[PDB]
């Protein structure tokens with residue numbers, strides 16, 4: 001023994017509506033590609049930035065679906081979208097550098113930022129404003145130390161989808177003040193209304209687009225993510241991978257290739273899931289409204305932030321009360337969504353009905 | 364844009380005998396377990412420290428095969444042995460802390476150490492001493508800033524196997540001076556003569572044992588590693604995983620479980636590979652001797668460090684000459700094995716014969 005490092009010591013330590021992954025299993029066409037890979041002996045080390053075939057397909061995906069002008073060399077395959085974010089912050093942050101985070105935010109953002117020595121500068125997003133950021137508020141938080149701004153749309157945990165105008169405004173601030181715009185787009189296919197716009201169309205040399213197969217193809221356990229952006233940053237990210245994970249699982253990389261190239265089979269899965277989620281969202285929202293429980297209507301992902309005022313004075317107490325009632329929910333504390341609890345509708349309509357029933361018994 | 368971080372900027376940028384992975388494909392019993400996992404829908408997120416079933420099997424493995432007294436909670440599954448090492452250094456090193464590394468060393472050790480802010484203190488290992496460390500030399504490099512000492516046996520790239528007495532001496536220094544002993548044991552099953560001793564038997568609260576399925580079961584592309592040691596360090600390591608990779612591939616975790624529980628099928632693979640490697644080693648060594656090329660006889664792994672004095676004045680030039688001759692070798696520069704080139708015998712005997720033929724044409 002000797003002692004743990006400071007960075008590690010500074011880290012923050014029934015019907016369930018807490019899921020952060022699809023209830024659907026990964027589509028058969030992807031499972032098949034994995035089986036073929038095993039049979040073909042695709043079990044050796046892959047390059048740090050990923051199997052070239054995948055990087056090629058990734059360039060086509062970002063260009064075709066997102067309108068991004070990228071080359072295969074400006075693409076990288078990682079161990080989940082989480083490692084894409086982690087490697088990114090390790091590659092661009094020096095201790096002291098600031099990163100603007102829009103609250104409510106995904107729990108992991110501030111963790112990853114601080115682990116690299118960065119300073120988290122939180123900019124609040126309001127319920128009454130539909131949880132869409134106000135570029136003016138963001139403009140006020142910019143300082144000479146600002147290294148990056150994190151944008152996540154469709155958003156976790158709000159479910160909000162930022163309109164193109166806002167995304168363009170934020171991209172302009174990055175160019176204007178010379179910093180990186182980190183765009184987390186993993187929920188792009190879980191969109192019920194509106195359109196998914198990619199900021200990188202506007203500021204390609206400032207934007208690092210993070211995505212992955214996780215939520216879109218029900219591949220959370222496969223651990224395959226991807227990102228694109230300025231070649232020098234992508235290269236730096238591959239360097240961090242070389243010294244940590246070496247490269248993602250080779251079998252999972254070949255399976256993901258199938259998910260991207262077999263557009264027909266994947267499209268069918270995406271449409272099926274989206275329609276299923278939409279039904280669940282509507283069902284949930286109607287029930288909450290009927291009970292007089294406030295919640296901003298989500299347009300993407302499979303989350304809903306519910307105001308817990310009528311349940312208890314704070315999210316923690318509210319989460320406990322609902323637990324007593326037989327409903328597991330995620331308190332919004334760690335998301336900086338105080339007075340709110342996060343509901344996930346990636347479960348059966350039956351479970352959603354049972355939860356609503358319980359909610360009523362609590363009121 | 365804005366700029367890359369200092370830590371990333373400070374990173375160091377035909378018959379082939381350069382392989383760092385087995386030429387054998389992963390055994391069918393492991394492939395089967397993976398297929399069953401897919402069929403059973405084991406595709407969701409796993410806990411950060413790994414699937415509990417695997418951690419249980421890991422405790423049995425370290426205890427049964429290595430004589431280590433560990434509990435499942437003092438076990439962790441990572442994305443390759445490389446991430447085990449990476450997370451470890453991120454969890455115990457503060458900028459300035461020193462880490463003793465025995466040269467020749469595996470290229471990645473100093474990279475990972477510096478990335479965490481540590482200082483690499485290199486202690487030389489001599490050819491004439493069979494590349495086995497001298498505890499006295501190691502004792503001289505210890506300072507009040509020493510945080511850890513890295514030991515790798517069987518060794519990459521030397522192939523040396525350290526005798527129990529030496530391992531015990533090094534473990535004693537760690538207790539005596541109060542620092543961590545990092546023992547990289549991934550090549551334990553690729554042993555031709557002698558016995559594999561685990562330092563952790565002597566100093567359990569000072570030793571972090573790193574291992575993995577990579578070289579032993581020809582699973583380099585599956586990316587599954589594991590380690591055991593002091594509960595607080597293991598816990599810290601799981602925390603780094605939570606904020607980076609989340610958890611290793613779920614399918615690969617279930618496949619690895621089979622490799623550890625089906626001792627019969629795995630033992631058979633290990634014995635087959637070991638016998639194949641032994642033959643190749645002997646063949647290679649005889650040929651080198653016949654040509655008058657010096658090389659310390661390896662007892663483990665599948666590497667051989669060859670003295671390039673008769674080929675050229677330095678490894679780089681020697682590597683180039685051999686390349687012209689149609690033989691790809693790894694120059695020992697990055698291993699701190701100057702005047703030497705690293706040969707890998709994880710190929711067919713035919714390719715080894717062809718390489719020897721070429722070597723002759725060069726002399």
Ligand SMILES: *Cc1c(COP(=O)(O)O)cnc(C)c1O
Nearest residue numbers: 080081082106156186212214225
């Ligand atoms: C799922 C998710 C990610 C990345 O997930 P991986 O499972 O690691 O691919 C990143 N951000 C948010 C908001 C997510 O929901």
Ligand SMILES: *Cc1c(COP(=O)(O)O)cnc(C)c1O
Nearest residue numbers: 443444445469519549575577588
């Ligand atoms: C293979 C190896 C490792 C770890 O490899 P993984 O493929 O990441 O499990 C660590 N040290 C040495 C010397 C190795 O040869």
